[PDB]
Design a protein around this ligand. Structure first.
Ligand SMILES: Cc1cc(=O)oc2cc(O[C@@H]3O[C@H](CO)[C@@H](O)[C@H](O[C@@H]4O[C@H](CO)[C@@H](O)[C@H](O)[C@H]4O)[C@H]3O)ccc12
Length: 273
């Protein structure tokens, strides 16, 4: 019942990318995270899934519908694609944590409630999420566990932590994403400062919580101490969190655990045995 350690490793998780990250952090990955879109069939996923299961890890897939908005989805216009994914995931048989339409309380994704076209509402979101789950259950894909998500902050008009919550009957895990951006954009914020408000909201739901994406910048503060403090906070005060999934990518800023030697040493120590 210890905290599970996961990561998006900055590239799709081939066998070598998983093993390299495990060498890097000095520990097994309990969870391996990958991002795919809604024009990707399971056969493209399968070699990555095999690598993850062969390593003895849980695959978490963030499933991003760039190709269909919530109205599209709830009206059934993607159902052939959803049905094929469900059938293929059932046939695969292994436990997959699937996180569709994430960060919908932001404004950066075309399925999010804050997205500037105004097309996605609480109602269309909930109906879309429920429709996906319904199709998977009709196809016997009970191995697929459903992850609800919020961004740490509500960004854009109409956004909230729970307005778009599809209900306990459709969710196995909840989750929060968030970053300490430092001065890269923004101000330096502790893990608590980033995550406390969203956690308070999700703690009202009797589902375990995953920190599905998090990381810190180097600039504007001490990233090594931030990492030490983040994991201590998770263990001390975020008792409903069961997993911490770092976002290891040199992208908007260097989120990587090895953005500096000091950060790497702190991460290796913080994740524990
Ligand atoms: C303006 C704002 C405010 C905030 O609180 O949070 C975010 C998050 C955000 O995008 C998400 O977080 C990171 C950091 O910006 C993005 O990199 C990430 O994009 C996803 O990255 C993966 C891996 O590179 C891709 O495969 C996915 O396709 C992509 O969606 C977002 O989750 C933006 C703005 C923002």
């Amino acid at each position: 019942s210890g905290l599970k350690i996961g990561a998006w490793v900055g590239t799709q998780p081939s066998e070598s990318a998983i093993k390299s990250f495990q060498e890097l952090q000095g520990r097994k990955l309990d969870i391996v995270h990958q991002f795919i879109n809604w024009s990707t069939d399971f056969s493209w996923v399968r070699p990555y899934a095999d690598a993850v299961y062969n390593n003895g890890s849980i695959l978490m897939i963030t499933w991003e519908p760039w190709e269909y908005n919530t109205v599209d989805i709830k009206n059934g216009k993607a159902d052939a694609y959803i049905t094929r994914m469900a059938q293929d995931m059932k046939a695969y048989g292994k436990e997959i944590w699937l996180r569709p339409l994430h960060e919908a309380n932001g404004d950066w994704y075309p399925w999010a409630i804050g997205y500037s076209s105004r097309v996605n509402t609480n109602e269309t979101y909930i109906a879309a999420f429920r429709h996906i789950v319904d199709i998977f259950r009709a196809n016997g894909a009970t191995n697929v566990k459903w992850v609800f998500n919020v961004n740490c902050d509500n960004v854009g008009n109409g956004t909230s932590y729970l307005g778009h919550y599809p209900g306990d009957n459709y969710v196995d895990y909840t989750s929060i994403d968030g970053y300490n951006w430092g001065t890269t954009q923004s101000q330096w914020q502790s893990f608590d400062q980033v995550f406390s408000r969203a956690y308070q909201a999700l703690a009202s739901i009797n589902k375990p919580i995953i920190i599905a994406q998090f990381a810190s910048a180097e600039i504007g503060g001490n990233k090594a101490r931030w990492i030490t403090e983040a994991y201590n906070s998770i263990r001390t005060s975020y008792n409903k969190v069961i997993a911490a999934v770092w976002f290891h990518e040199n992208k908007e800023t260097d989120w990587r655990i090895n953005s500096s030697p000091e950060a790497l040493a702190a991460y290796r120590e913080a994740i524990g045995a």
